[PDB]
Write a protein that binds this ligand. Sequence first.
Ligand SMILES: CO[C@@H]1O[C@H](COS(=O)(=O)O)[C@@H](O)[C@H](O[C@@H]2O[C@H](CO)[C@H](O)[C@H](O)[C@H]2O)[C@H]1NC(C)=O
Ligand SMILES: CO[C@@H]1O[C@H](COS(=O)(=O)O)[C@@H](O)[C@H](O[C@@H]2O[C@H](CO)[C@H](O)[C@H](O)[C@H]2O)[C@H]1NC(C)=O
Lengths: 133, 133
Amino acid sequence: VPHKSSLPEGIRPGTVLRIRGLVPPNASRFHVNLLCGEEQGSDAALHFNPRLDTSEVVFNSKEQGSWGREERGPGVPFQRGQPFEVLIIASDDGFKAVVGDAQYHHFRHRLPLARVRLVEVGGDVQLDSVRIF
Amino acid sequence: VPHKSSLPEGIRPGTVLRIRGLVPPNASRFHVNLLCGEEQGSDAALHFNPRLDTSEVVFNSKEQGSWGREERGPGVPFQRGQPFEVLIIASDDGFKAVVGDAQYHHFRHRLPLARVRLVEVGGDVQLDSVRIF
Ligand SMILES: CO[C@@H]1O[C@H](COS(=O)(=O)O)[C@@H](O)[C@H](O[C@@H]2O[C@H](CO)[C@H](O)[C@H](O)[C@H]2O)[C@H]1NC(C)=O
Ligand SMILES: CO[C@@H]1O[C@H](COS(=O)(=O)O)[C@@H](O)[C@H](O[C@@H]2O[C@H](CO)[C@H](O)[C@H](O)[C@H]2O)[C@H]1NC(C)=O
């Protein structure tokens, strides 16, 4: 069951998104989206996509219906059947992705932080909790 | 403990200080300090001080050698003999304290965030992890 929730006051430099979860033994890929609307085709300020099937972690944005320029993280800090903790930190420069006990990747802002209205966590993932700090 | 770490690039909005450890069986109090210098006698932008004995968590700053006005968090989110996790998040407004799963307290800036250069953790506390993202 996915987490999809509205952010009334949007997000700000200092906003922290904490995702504690579990990658299922049959999992292929799951996603963490910071969205600008409620639609399935809304703009995405951030698309965080761990892919167990291809052993990649793809960062991207989405504007006017098109995925932007793909960025990729160093290695895959995720594993089928293993728990994870992910911090997504909105700074004034971009989003910092923290997995485990280390800084994983920095994703520079392509869309203004002011446009982010919604958080989505879904895909092949089992959730313990999703927090907005 | 006493963990003393420098922050060379300083800290900007979007910085997270994660402290993991254990509160001792007969702990009285411990502290987390963000100092505006490399020495302990430096000014404190933030004094995070859980007091297990008087059952309170005191927030304050130190300027020219004297404490500012004391703030107190809602109750004590710490239990003696139990492990804890604390997030200290820097934003535009101030510092956001997160203990466990709950946003605990917002401490609005008194000293400029750009003055912070050192993290100090000490007191009755067994540290397991101190990290800055
Ligand atoms: C042109 O098709 C697109 O190719 C990308 C690169 O594929 S790869 O195998 O060389 O890595 C794919 O990433 C892309 O897949 C889509 O990627 C976006 C993020 O950029 C998002 O994760 C989508 O869920 C994913 O399908 C693929 N696009 C399509 C339409 O297939
Ligand atoms: C009147 O002296 C000051 O009283 C504060 C509240 O007293 S209490 O009875 O409600 O507990 C004390 O917190 C304060 O102690 C100092 O507080 C600062 C943070 O503001 C810091 O924790 C110091 O380590 C602590 O001594 C006390 N002030 C002084 C100067 O003793």
